Design an enzyme around this catalytic site. Structure first.
Site, mmCIF file in Angstrom:
data_model
loop_
_atom_site.group_PDB
_atom_site.id
_atom_site.type_symbol
_atom_site.label_atom_id
_atom_site.label_comp_id
_atom_site.label_asym_id
_atom_site.label_seq_id
_atom_site.Cartn_x
_atom_site.Cartn_y
_atom_site.Cartn_z
ATOM 1 C CG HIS E 58 -1.207 1.340 1.772
ATOM 2 N ND1 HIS E 58 -2.047 2.242 1.160
ATOM 3 C CD2 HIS E 58 -0.767 1.938 2.899
ATOM 4 C CE1 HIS E 58 -2.105 3.343 1.884
ATOM 5 N NE2 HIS E 58 -1.343 3.178 2.946
ATOM 6 C CG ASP E 88 4.883 17.870 -28.513
ATOM 7 O OD1 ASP E 88 4.324 17.403 -29.525
ATOM 8 O OD2 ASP E 88 6.120 18.015 -28.463
ATOM 9 C CD1 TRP E 123 8.260 2.971 0.779
ATOM 10 C CD2 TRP E 123 8.409 4.170 2.657
ATOM 11 N NE1 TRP E 123 8.742 4.212 0.446
ATOM 12 C CE2 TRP E 123 8.841 4.967 1.582
ATOM 13 C CE3 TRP E 123 8.413 4.714 3.942
ATOM 14 C CZ2 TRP E 123 9.271 6.276 1.750
ATOM 15 C CZ3 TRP E 123 8.843 6.015 4.107
ATOM 16 C CH2 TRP E 123 9.265 6.782 3.018
ATOM 17 C CB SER E 153 9.184 6.220 -15.177
ATOM 18 O OG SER E 153 8.545 6.819 -14.065
ATOM 19 C CB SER E 154 9.889 9.760 -11.669
ATOM 20 O OG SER E 154 10.292 10.871 -10.908
ATOM 21 C CG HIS E 237 14.021 15.276 3.894
ATOM 22 N ND1 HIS E 237 12.871 15.377 4.644
ATOM 23 C CD2 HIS E 237 14.389 16.543 3.594
ATOM 24 C CE1 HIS E 237 12.573 16.652 4.818
ATOM 25 N NE2 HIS E 237 13.474 17.381 4.185
ATOM 26 C CD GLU E 239 9.808 10.178 -3.824
ATOM 27 O OE1 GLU E 239 10.720 10.247 -4.672
ATOM 28 O OE2 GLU E 239 8.598 10.197 -4.124
ATOM 29 C CE1 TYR E 241 9.904 19.219 3.105
ATOM 30 C CE2 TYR E 241 12.050 18.200 3.422
ATOM 31 C CZ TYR E 241 10.947 18.856 3.924
ATOM 32 O OH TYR E 241 10.868 19.155 5.258
ATOM 33 C CB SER E 252 0.873 29.210 -5.733
ATOM 34 O OG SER E 252 1.404 28.123 -6.463
ATOM 35 C CG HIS E 286 15.083 14.628 9.461
ATOM 36 N ND1 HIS E 286 15.485 15.255 8.303
ATOM 37 C CD2 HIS E 286 13.858 14.113 9.202
ATOM 38 C CE1 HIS E 286 14.551 15.115 7.380
ATOM 39 N NE2 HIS E 286 13.551 14.428 7.901
ATOM 40 C CG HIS E 287 13.927 10.327 7.942
ATOM 41 N ND1 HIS E 287 12.565 10.396 7.749
ATOM 42 C CD2 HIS E 287 14.474 11.224 7.090
ATOM 43 C CE1 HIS E 287 12.300 11.300 6.823
ATOM 44 N NE2 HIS E 287 13.441 11.808 6.399
ATOM 45 C CB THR E 312 7.540 25.737 4.918
ATOM 46 O OG1 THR E 312 8.687 24.974 4.538
ATOM 47 C CG2 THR E 312 6.312 25.032 4.369
ATOM 48 C CE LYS E 315 6.163 27.061 -1.462
ATOM 49 N NZ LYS E 315 5.804 27.733 -2.734
ATOM 50 N NE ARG E 434 5.815 3.794 10.907
ATOM 51 C CZ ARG E 434 6.670 4.426 10.115
ATOM 52 N NH1 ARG E 434 7.676 5.112 10.637
ATOM 53 N NH2 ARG E 434 6.522 4.373 8.799
HETATM 54 C C1 HEA Z 1 1.122 9.096 -0.661
HETATM 55 C C2 HEA Z 1 1.171 8.672 0.597
HETATM 56 C C3 HEA Z 1 0.116 8.039 1.417
HETATM 57 C C4 HEA Z 1 -1.219 8.220 1.454
HETATM 58 C C5 HEA Z 1 -2.124 9.113 0.663
HETATM 59 C C6 HEA Z 1 -1.713 7.336 2.473
HETATM 60 C C7 HEA Z 1 -3.009 7.237 2.790
HETATM 61 C C8 HEA Z 1 -3.504 6.481 3.811
HETATM 62 N N1 HEA Z 1 -2.756 5.622 4.604
HETATM 63 FE FE1 HEA Z 1 -0.837 5.239 4.559
HETATM 64 N N2 HEA Z 1 1.066 5.077 4.583
HETATM 65 C C9 HEA Z 1 1.989 5.683 3.787
HETATM 66 C C10 HEA Z 1 1.644 6.539 2.761
HETATM 67 C C11 HEA Z 1 0.397 7.035 2.447
HETATM 68 N N3 HEA Z 1 -0.710 6.613 3.079
HETATM 69 C C12 HEA Z 1 3.369 5.288 4.150
HETATM 70 C C13 HEA Z 1 4.720 5.712 3.537
HETATM 71 C C14 HEA Z 1 3.217 4.441 5.203
HETATM 72 C C15 HEA Z 1 4.283 3.714 6.039
HETATM 73 C C16 HEA Z 1 4.608 2.324 5.663
HETATM 74 C C17 HEA Z 1 5.785 1.850 6.414
HETATM 75 O O1 HEA Z 1 6.702 2.683 6.566
HETATM 76 O O2 HEA Z 1 5.641 0.825 7.110
HETATM 77 C C18 HEA Z 1 1.819 4.338 5.460
HETATM 78 C C19 HEA Z 1 1.328 3.545 6.464
HETATM 79 C C20 HEA Z 1 0.037 3.450 6.847
HETATM 80 C C21 HEA Z 1 -0.438 2.683 7.980
HETATM 81 C C22 HEA Z 1 0.467 1.870 8.924
HETATM 82 C C23 HEA Z 1 1.201 2.703 9.978
HETATM 83 C C24 HEA Z 1 2.610 2.199 10.247
HETATM 84 O O3 HEA Z 1 2.783 0.976 10.389
HETATM 85 O O4 HEA Z 1 3.550 2.972 9.999
HETATM 86 C C25 HEA Z 1 -1.793 2.857 7.998
HETATM 87 C C26 HEA Z 1 -2.643 2.319 8.904
HETATM 88 O O5 HEA Z 1 -3.402 3.059 9.464
HETATM 89 C C27 HEA Z 1 -2.121 3.728 6.870
HETATM 90 C C28 HEA Z 1 -3.385 4.177 6.479
HETATM 91 C C29 HEA Z 1 -3.672 5.101 5.474
HETATM 92 C C30 HEA Z 1 -5.003 5.602 5.240
HETATM 93 C C31 HEA Z 1 -6.235 5.250 5.991
HETATM 94 C C32 HEA Z 1 -4.932 6.469 4.202
HETATM 95 C C33 HEA Z 1 -6.117 7.218 3.659
HETATM 96 O O6 HEA Z 1 -5.767 8.592 3.448
HETATM 97 C C34 HEA Z 1 -6.611 6.706 2.321
HETATM 98 C C35 HEA Z 1 -8.098 6.915 2.128
HETATM 99 C C36 HEA Z 1 -8.356 8.319 1.657
HETATM 100 C C37 HEA Z 1 -8.645 8.585 0.383
HETATM 101 C C38 HEA Z 1 -10.042 8.304 -0.061
HETATM 102 C C39 HEA Z 1 -7.852 9.496 -0.468
HETATM 103 C C40 HEA Z 1 -6.851 8.796 -1.398
HETATM 104 C C41 HEA Z 1 -7.478 8.095 -2.579
HETATM 105 C C42 HEA Z 1 -7.165 8.316 -3.871
HETATM 106 C C43 HEA Z 1 -7.493 7.460 -5.088
HETATM 107 C C44 HEA Z 1 -6.411 9.543 -4.174
HETATM 108 C C45 HEA Z 1 -7.228 10.555 -4.919
HETATM 109 C C46 HEA Z 1 -6.521 11.102 -6.144
HETATM 110 C C47 HEA Z 1 -7.061 11.078 -7.381
HETATM 111 C C48 HEA Z 1 -8.112 10.071 -7.731
HETATM 112 C C49 HEA Z 1 -7.126 12.331 -8.182
HETATM 113 N N4 HEA Z 1 -0.988 4.074 6.159
HETATM 114 C C1 HEA Z 2 5.343 14.194 2.195
HETATM 115 C C2 HEA Z 2 5.522 15.339 2.837
HETATM 116 C C3 HEA Z 2 6.324 15.627 4.045
HETATM 117 C C4 HEA Z 2 6.675 16.862 4.414
HETATM 118 C C5 HEA Z 2 6.384 18.159 3.726
HETATM 119 C C6 HEA Z 2 7.420 16.736 5.628
HETATM 120 C C7 HEA Z 2 7.921 17.790 6.276
HETATM 121 C C8 HEA Z 2 8.637 17.731 7.428
HETATM 122 N N1 HEA Z 2 8.939 16.568 8.114
HETATM 123 FE FE1 HEA Z 2 8.482 14.713 7.678
HETATM 124 N N2 HEA Z 2 8.182 12.924 7.076
HETATM 125 C C9 HEA Z 2 7.460 12.487 6.005
HETATM 126 C C10 HEA Z 2 6.774 13.355 5.173
HETATM 127 C C11 HEA Z 2 6.873 14.734 5.089
HETATM 128 N N3 HEA Z 2 7.539 15.427 6.038
HETATM 129 C C12 HEA Z 2 7.505 11.004 5.874
HETATM 130 C C13 HEA Z 2 6.819 10.106 4.815
HETATM 131 C C14 HEA Z 2 8.287 10.594 6.922
HETATM 132 C C15 HEA Z 2 8.786 9.209 7.380
HETATM 133 C C16 HEA Z 2 7.827 8.129 7.696
HETATM 134 C C17 HEA Z 2 8.433 6.802 7.437
HETATM 135 O O1 HEA Z 2 9.657 6.708 7.637
HETATM 136 O O2 HEA Z 2 7.678 5.841 7.171
HETATM 137 C C18 HEA Z 2 8.699 11.772 7.614
HETATM 138 C C19 HEA Z 2 9.503 11.696 8.716
HETATM 139 C C20 HEA Z 2 9.963 12.740 9.432
HETATM 140 C C21 HEA Z 2 10.830 12.618 10.583
HETATM 141 C C22 HEA Z 2 11.356 11.270 11.121
HETATM 142 C C23 HEA Z 2 10.694 10.726 12.392
HETATM 143 C C24 HEA Z 2 11.046 9.265 12.642
HETATM 144 O O3 HEA Z 2 10.912 8.435 11.723
HETATM 145 O O4 HEA Z 2 11.695 9.009 13.670
HETATM 146 C C25 HEA Z 2 11.055 13.895 11.018
HETATM 147 C C26 HEA Z 2 11.831 14.229 12.078
HETATM 148 O O5 HEA Z 2 12.714 15.027 11.931
HETATM 149 C C27 HEA Z 2 10.309 14.780 10.120
HETATM 150 C C28 HEA Z 2 10.220 16.178 10.166
HETATM 151 C C29 HEA Z 2 9.674 17.007 9.179
HETATM 152 C C30 HEA Z 2 9.830 18.442 9.186
HETATM 153 C C31 HEA Z 2 10.562 19.247 10.192
HETATM 154 C C32 HEA Z 2 9.186 18.930 8.096
HETATM 155 C C33 HEA Z 2 9.099 20.393 7.734
HETATM 156 O O6 HEA Z 2 9.405 20.578 6.346
HETATM 157 C C34 HEA Z 2 7.716 21.007 7.917
HETATM 158 C C35 HEA Z 2 7.763 22.436 8.430
HETATM 159 C C36 HEA Z 2 6.442 23.141 8.254
HETATM 160 C C37 HEA Z 2 5.925 24.010 9.142
HETATM 161 C C38 HEA Z 2 6.572 24.121 10.484
HETATM 162 C C39 HEA Z 2 4.566 24.602 9.046
HETATM 163 C C40 HEA Z 2 4.431 25.938 8.289
HETATM 164 C C41 HEA Z 2 5.268 27.067 8.838
HETATM 165 C C42 HEA Z 2 4.841 27.982 9.728
HETATM 166 C C43 HEA Z 2 3.396 28.388 10.000
HETATM 167 C C44 HEA Z 2 5.836 28.979 10.170
HETATM 168 C C45 HEA Z 2 7.068 28.393 10.802
HETATM 169 C C46 HEA Z 2 6.763 27.524 12.010
HETATM 170 C C47 HEA Z 2 7.060 27.851 13.290
HETATM 171 C C48 HEA Z 2 7.946 29.008 13.635
HETATM 172 C C49 HEA Z 2 6.891 26.848 14.381
HETATM 173 N N4 HEA Z 2 9.637 14.055 9.148
HETATM 174 CU CU LIG Z 3 12.145 13.588 6.475
#
Ligand code: HEA
Ligand code: HEA
Ligand SMILES: [Cu+2]
Ligand SMILES: CCCCCCCCCCC(=O)OC[C@H](COP(=O)(O)OC[C@H](O)COP(=O)(O)OC[C@@H](COC(=O)CC)OC(=O)CCC)OC(=O)CCCCCCCC
Ligand SMILES: CCCCCCCCCCCCCCCC(=O)OC[C@H](COP(=O)([O-])OCC[N+](C)(C)C)OC(=O)CCCCCCCCCCCCCCC
Ligand SMILES: CCCCCCCCCCCCCCCC(=O)OC[C@H](COP(=O)([O-])OCC[N+](C)(C)C)OC(=O)CCCCCCCCCCCCCCC
Ligand SMILES: CCCCCCCCCCCCCCCCCCCC(=O)O[C@H](COC(=O)CCCCCCCCCCCCCC)COP(=O)(O)OCCN
Ligand SMILES: CCCCCCCCCCCCCCCCCCCC(=O)O[C@H](COC(=O)CCCCCCCCCCCCCC)COP(=O)(O)OCCN
Ligand SMILES: CCCCCCCCCCCCCCCCCCCC(=O)O[C@H](COC(=O)CCCCCCCCCCCCCC)COP(=O)(O)OCCN
Ligand SMILES: CCCCCCCCCCCCCCCCCCCC(=O)O[C@H](COC(=O)CCCCCCCCCCCCCC)COP(=O)(O)OCCN
Lengths: 38, 59, 128, 55, 530, 99, 53, 51
Positions: E58, E88, E123, E153-154, E237, E239, E241, E252, E286-287, E312, E315, E434
């Site tokens: 998933h 194109d 994953w 592809s990407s 990270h 990916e 972003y 925007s 940081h992960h 951010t 933005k 998890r």
């Molecule tokens: C793109 C990223 C993405 C999205 C959208 C989701 C969406 C959801 N995810 Fe998932 N999820 C992950 C990425 C994502 N997840 C990742 C990386 C992990 C961790 C795996 C690992 O590290 O072990 C994870 C893990 C994860 C867990 C396990 C937690 C753990 O073990 O770490 C669970 C269980 O609750 C969960 C649930 C859901 C649910 C309920 C949604 C719901 O939001 C989905 C239902 C909502 C929808 C209806 C909207 C989406 C449907 C579409 C079709 C999109 C629409 C777009 C077009 C059609 C235009 N996700």
């Molecule tokens: C897809 C989008 C996405 C985005 C945008 C971000 C954005 C950020 N993520 Fe996250 N992150 C994930 C997706 C994302 N992350 C995923 C998939 C994982 C890992 C899960 C996995 O391993 O399965 C992860 C994991 C992850 C970890 C690892 C935790 C762990 O596994 O132990 C940490 C910790 O540092 C982190 C931090 C952040 C931070 C600091 C930002 C920052 O960029 C965000 C900052 C934004 C703001 C703060 C808000 C707007 C700003 C303000 C209003 C003004 C400024 C704010 C203040 C002064 C407070 N992310």
């Molecule tokens: Cu990160």
């Protein structure tokens, strides 16, 4: 004379309504725990 | 220790290393509620008070 | 001049008016505007504001008048068809854990009370 | 030498560009023979690879 | 048609697959959340395998087969030809392999589950869990190849966008005046280029340590599994972003169209948008705060990944400045783009709480992380994908989408997925780990709260299929009755109705000045700007 | 820039209006600024509507003036000031018409 | 006649600082009525462990 | 698609003029995509003892 009583009346029922959003958008787990402790 | 059903906070601190985390998880979230308190307010004064503004200040 | 029986109530009559007649009346009205004003009669004066700045086509609202309730009756009838569909997949469910039925949960409390697990806070561990 | 010669043949050919070479008729039917086998035999062994039957 | 090299008809094949991989990527998350409904394995009988297979099944369909091919392929192959002024793409023949390897990236993944083992690796495919002594069959062999077909592809799907923007513009389109959706993907294309060859070595080395026993990662031989934790996460990270910068391009455009006003600080929005992309490179461990790094190395990262919250904030506060003065027309792309501005930013506050090395040591691998990264994936990259479809659906398909029925699909997504991902912060602050099929009994509280919501969001997605049915069958009978909204910009206060139909679309982009649908040659003359 | 440079610039552009389009596109950005327009420039916003023979773009002046006045006390003193040039042209307001 | 200016400027300063004042009445309660309430219990129980001598 | 920029002719579907109703071929593309994990939950349970 204008912005001392007209800027108020736009904002008095606003914060009276804005806190009602966060008590449902964020405070909704304070009801499912209250309803069924079992 | 033991997790609690329908809980929302940390488990009970039994270590000064653990006790430092609870005074840093609350030191952070005190500065996260000003930012969430701003965004939740600055998005309700716009969707409500400015959706009835037919003359857009486009300059 | 322009007759009374063509601009009488141009609110409910602008839509469902035939389109060749619908721009015939704006042709007669555009010649009455090449006059000194305050000589146009009031069914001819309030019905040129409805053409230029009324509510039809453009300046139609994004939601109709009986449409905000249809939004809130699809939300509140989507949560009902969600939970009602949740019970069918749970009644077609496997047998649950043996450690939940309120008596396993009870004797796992004085086991913690005799060890002082959560001193300040709750260690109730009771959720049948 | 053949650059102007092929340019008469390629320009205004009214053919697909992968059929526009004069030395292209033999380039395809053996190529469509190795293409008609390399996309089924990696996939026909998949029901053989579901029951543990390996080699 | 199948192998037509027109960039318009490739991006409609991209979008035709990102819902098929979507309704497979969320049917797996249905069964995942159905198993976390109660303690004890309910629907899966006793199998803790096929749960680390469904989670990786998933989480990679959502990342690499939904949000990657839609926000880069499904839109970038349709809008970057169109908004800039190209006919194109610059490389239109490799534009077709960038789509047609994605179903071949699906046969390399659905058959990775049907084989006897099942890739139960998660994953983040870690080396000793996925090593050949642990995972024996050909299950994880295909799961590290479907991740390679999408990696390739990407990658050429972003070389297609650096030599499109840099030379194939119009006359007056200088380098400081572009649409922000193009500056989203052109900045993204300098991250897709400089992070995917890092990944392609970090997976092939795991292939070499599995059937060629080279011991890049094998412990018997000195090969660390901790080299993987900085080499995969050097891709990881950037990916995440990349799933948000085209998400920062659509928002925007929407929030400054449905507000009749140009965006606040456009030159400020393009410098704080590559600074996210550039500084996102320098924060990649940081992960892995707890994996045993140095006391100054973690001291650098706890100060360096907080600086991602500097641009951010620019933005976001500018999106709270570009709608302050102007009007607000609350249609469906404006509803998504205004709930994106509340649920993504709450996924940012949980970001900077996790960002500290002094606080990730009580939060790693818990459910507080999954509460954080789903507020920025299903609420920051689905809230900008639904706000991009509804913003360009009748302009591109030609048919309107029953606007009264797309408002109830917004609210069932808003409150029907906030009910899932908000109580995840409570299960993780206690310490639920998890990827587990079962849990201690005290974690049955919110895991039934978050289980009632996955039927709400996936009932809205069943409704979204019907909107796609109403848009294709009698989607022409929508703009002739009062079902939909036709003009996305209502005229001004002193703009008369009879003069509006002369000057109808007051857009700031070419995308609406085209016909609906656009032509097969929508640019047969070099257009001019200013 | 200032209040007076606002007045002198838009009271000038109303003269070369010549059309219905270049009244409404100039009446728009004479009202879509941060400030409130003077009655000197809005007098040429009614004379512009008289030069093009269109009455509801002169009734929409006083309705755009009603929402963007920020005070009813600063509107009735502003309405009675314009009553010298609003009784010549016979321009009604939207509440008196009752449409 | 009055040269009235600043209707949006008086609705940004009034608009920003009443959110900072609204970002405090949710946060100063969270650090006093919850955080100092939680440190009240742990200061109490640890003082009921040093009593045993 | 190379030419004929009509209304339904930029999509590889066949919406109107189909012999069979389109809801067969539209839900039958999106429910089939929904039923692929429910055959991964079938041939991996029946292989591994469960049912
Ligand atoms: C793109 C990223 C993405 C999205 C959208 C989701 C969406 C959801 N995810 Fe998932 N999820 C992950 C990425 C994502 N997840 C990742 C990386 C992990 C961790 C795996 C690992 O590290 O072990 C994870 C893990 C994860 C867990 C396990 C937690 C753990 O073990 O770490 C669970 C269980 O609750 C969960 C649930 C859901 C649910 C309920 C949604 C719901 O939001 C989905 C239902 C909502 C929808 C209806 C909207 C989406 C449907 C579409 C079709 C999109 C629409 C777009 C077009 C059609 C235009 N996700
Ligand atoms: C897809 C989008 C996405 C985005 C945008 C971000 C954005 C950020 N993520 Fe996250 N992150 C994930 C997706 C994302 N992350 C995923 C998939 C994982 C890992 C899960 C996995 O391993 O399965 C992860 C994991 C992850 C970890 C690892 C935790 C762990 O596994 O132990 C940490 C910790 O540092 C982190 C931090 C952040 C931070 C600091 C930002 C920052 O960029 C965000 C900052 C934004 C703001 C703060 C808000 C707007 C700003 C303000 C209003 C003004 C400024 C704010 C203040 C002064 C407070 N992310
Ligand atoms: Cu990160
Ligand atoms: C894998 C793919 C599976 C896909 C399955 C998804 C199913 C979703 C179907 C949603 C749907 O089709 O609804 C759209 C349909 C047409 O609406 P429209 O946009 O043309 O405008 C109508 C007009 O503007 C106002 O309609 P009106 O107000 O006059 O009717 C009242 C209507 C409102 O109540 C509800 O919506 C919930 C019951 O109540 C009824 O009709 C009850 C009749 C028994 O509106 C309806 O009439 C819905 C009737 C109920 C259908 C069953 C509901 C199940 C939850
Ligand atoms: C906000 C949008 C809608 C939110 C919907 C939330 C749904 C909450 C829910 O489903 O909670 C169910 C609890 C369970 O109660 P329990 O203590 O676990 O009892 C056992 C019941 N089992 C699990 C055996 C079936 O039972 C309850 O607590 C039922 C109470 C119903 C609360 C309704 C919503 C709360 C107010 C939101 C405003
Ligand atoms: C119609 C049929 C009604 C059935 C009676 C009922 O209330 O059932 C409770 C169901 C099942 O709950 P369960 O305890 O998980 O049952 C399955 C147990 N097995 C068999 C797996 C061991 O649980 C549910 O249906 C969910 C109950 C909790 C949610 C309450 C409603 C919330 C609505 C909020 C709206 C706002
Ligand atoms: C969102 C804004 C916060 C409030 C939303 C509603 C939930 C909070 C009230 C209900 C509640 O029990 O939360 C209290 C604290 O919440 C808070 O202090 C949240 C800070 C805002 C704790 O309530 P309690 O005193 O029962 O604590 C029990 C200790 N065992
Ligand atoms: C930024 C946003 C990121 C998300 C942050 C996640 C939460 C952060 C921690 C704050 C939790 C405060 C809860 C205080 C509390 O103890 O209330 C619980 C009950 O509240 C409830 O059951 C309802 C919970 C309402 C909490 C809403 C939180 C909103 C965020 C700010 C507040 C106590 O219950 P218990 O565990 O003593 O019960 C034992 C049963 N035997
Ligand atoms: C009528 C009698 C037949 C069953 C329905 C009773 C209506 C009152 C609610 C109880 C129904 C029910 O079993 O769901 C309860 C939870 O409440 C809910 O989930 C919401 C119930 C209302 C909708 C279970 O709770 P439980 O304590 O009855 O037993 C649960 C297993 N032990
Ligand atoms: C890695 C793949 C190559 C990366 C560089 C490709 C871009 C530069 C080369 C180039 O322009 O030719 C491409 C064809 O190459 C290709 O398509 C061949 C690459 C795919 C096969 C790789 C075989 C490796 C042995 C574009 O092709 P185009 O026809 O769109 O350019 C129309 C020109 N006017």
């Amino acid at each position: 004379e204008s912005w001392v009583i007209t800027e108020g009346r736009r904002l008095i029922p606003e914060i009276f309504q804005w806190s009602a959003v966060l008590s449902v958008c964020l405070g909704w787990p304070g009801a499912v725990y209250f309803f069924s402790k079992a | 220790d033991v997790p609690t059903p329908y809980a929302c906070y940390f488990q009970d601190s039994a270590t000064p290393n653990q006790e430092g985390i609870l005074e840093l998880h609350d030191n952070i979230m005190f500065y996260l509620l000003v930012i969430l308190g701003l965004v939740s307010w600055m998005l309700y004064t716009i969707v409500m008070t400015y959706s009835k503004n037919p003359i857009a200040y486009k300059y | 001049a322009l007759s009374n029986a063509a601009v009488m109530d141009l609110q409910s009559r602008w839509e469902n008016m035939p389109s060749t007649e619908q721009q015939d009346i704006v042709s007669k009205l555009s010649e009455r505007q090449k006059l000194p004003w305050a000589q146009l009669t009031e069914p001819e004066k309030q019905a040129v504001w409805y053409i230029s700045y009324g509510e039809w086509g453009p300046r139609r609202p994004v939601l109709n008048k009986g449409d905000s309730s249809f939004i809130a009756k699809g939300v509140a009838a989507g949560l009902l068809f969600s939970v009602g569909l949740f019970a069918v997949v749970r009644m077609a469910g496997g047998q649950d854990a043996k450690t939940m039925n309120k008596e396993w949960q009870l004797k796992s409390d004085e086991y913690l009370k005799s060890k002082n697990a959560n001193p300040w806070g709750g260690y109730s561990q009771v959720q049948s | 030498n053949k650059v102007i010669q092929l340019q008469k043949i390629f320009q205004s050919s009214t053919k697909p560009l992968w059929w526009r070479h004069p030395r292209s008729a033999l380039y395809l039917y053996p190529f469509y023979a190795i293409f008609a086998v390399a996309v089924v035999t990696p996939l026909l062994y998949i029901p053989n690879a579901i029951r543990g039957i390996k080699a | 048609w199948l192998y037509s090299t027109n960039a318009k008809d490739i991006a409609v094949l991209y979008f035709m697959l990102a819902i098929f991989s979507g309704m497979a990527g969320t049917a797996m998350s249905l069964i995942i959340r159905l198993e976390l409904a109660a303690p004890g394995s309910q629907y899966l009988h006793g199998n803790s395998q096929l749960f680390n297979v469904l989670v990786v099944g998933h989480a990679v369909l959502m990342i690499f087969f939904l949000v990657m091919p839609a926000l880069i392929g499904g839109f970038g192959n349709y809008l970057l030809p169109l908004m800039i002024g190209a006919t194109d793409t610059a490389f239109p023949r490799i534009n077709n392999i960038a789509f047609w390897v994605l179903p071949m990236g699906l046969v390399c993944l659905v058959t990775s589950t049907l084989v006897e083992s099942g890739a139960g690796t998660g994953w983040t495919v870690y080396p000793p869990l996925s090593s050949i002594q642990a995972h024996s069959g050909p299950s994880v062999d295909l799961a590290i190849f479907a991740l390679h077909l999408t990696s390739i592809s990407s990658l050429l799907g972003a070389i297609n966008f650096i030599v499109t923007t840099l030379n194939m513009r119009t006359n007056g389109m200088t380098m400081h005046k572009l649409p922000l959706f193009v500056w989203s993907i052109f900045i993204t294309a300098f991250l897709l280029l400089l992070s995917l060859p890092v990944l392609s070595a970090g997976i092939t080395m795991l292939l070499l340590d599995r059937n060629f026993n080279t011991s890049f990662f094998e412990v018997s031989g000195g090969g660390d599994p901790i080299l993987y934790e900085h080499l995969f996460w050097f891709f990881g990270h950037p990916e995440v972003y990349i799933l948000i910068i085209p998400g920062f391009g659509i928002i925007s455009h929407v929030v400054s169209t449905y507000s009749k006003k140009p965006v606040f600080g456009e030159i400020s929005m393009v410098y704080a948008m590559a600074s996210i992309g550039l500084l996102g490179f320098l924060v990649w461990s940081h992960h892995m705060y707890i994996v045993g790094l140095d006391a100054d190395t973690r001291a650098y990262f706890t100060s360096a990944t907080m600086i991602i919250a500097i641009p951010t904030g620019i933005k976001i506060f500018s999106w709270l400045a570009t709608i302050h003065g102007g009007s607000i027309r609350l249609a469906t792309p404006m509803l998504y783009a205004i709930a994106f501005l509340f649920l993504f930013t709450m996924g940012g506050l949980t970001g900077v709480a996790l960002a500290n090395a002094s606080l990730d040591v009580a939060f790693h691998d818990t459910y507080y992380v999954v509460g954080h990264f789903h507020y920025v994936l299903s609420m920051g990259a689905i809230f900008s994908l639904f706000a991009g479809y509804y913003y360009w659906s009748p302009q591109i398909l030609g048919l309107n989408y029953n606007e009264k029925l797309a408002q109830i699909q917004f609210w069932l997504i808003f409150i029907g997925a906030n009910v899932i991902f908000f109580p995840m912060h409570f299960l993780g602050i206690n310490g639920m780990p998890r990827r587990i099929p079962d849990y201690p009994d005290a974690f049955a509280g919110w895991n039934y709260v978050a289980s009632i919501g996955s039927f709400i969001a996936t009932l809205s997605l069943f409704l979204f299929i019907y909107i796609l049915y109403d848009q294709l069958v009698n989607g022409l009978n929508n703009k002739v009755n009062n079902k939909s909204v036709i003009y996305n910009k209502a005229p001004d206060f002193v703009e008369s109705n009879t003069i509006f139909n002369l000057n109808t679309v007051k857009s700031s982009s070419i995308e609406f000045l085209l016909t609906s649908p656009p032509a097969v040659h929508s640019f047969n003359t070099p257009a001019v700007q200013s | 820039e200032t209040f007076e440079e606002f007045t002198a610039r838009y009271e000038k552009e109303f003269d070369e209006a010549y059309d219905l389009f270049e009244v409404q596109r100039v009446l728009n950005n004479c009202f879509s600024y941060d400030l409130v327009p003077a009655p000197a420039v809005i007098e040429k916003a009614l004379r512009a509507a008289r030069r093009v023979n269109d009455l509801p773009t002169a009734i929409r002046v006083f309705e755009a003036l009603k929402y963007k006045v920020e005070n009813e006390d600063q509107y009735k003193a502003y309405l009675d000031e314009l009553k010298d040039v609003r009784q010549e042209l016979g321009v009604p307001l939207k509440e008196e018409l009752f449409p | 006649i009055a040269p009235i200016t600043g209707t949006i400027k008086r609705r940004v300063i009034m608009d920003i600082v009443l959110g900072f004042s609204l970002g405090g009445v949710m946060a100063s309660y969270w650090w006093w009525g919850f955080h100092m309430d939680k440190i009240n219990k742990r200061e109490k129980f640890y003082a009921e462990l040093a009593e045993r001598k | 698609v190379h030419f004929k920029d009509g209304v339904y002719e930029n999509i590889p579907f066949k919406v109107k003029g189909r012999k069979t109703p389109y809801a067969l071929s539209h839900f039958g593309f999106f429910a089939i995509g929904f039923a692929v994990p429910f055959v991964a939950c079938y041939v991996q349970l029946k292989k591994s003892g469960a049912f």
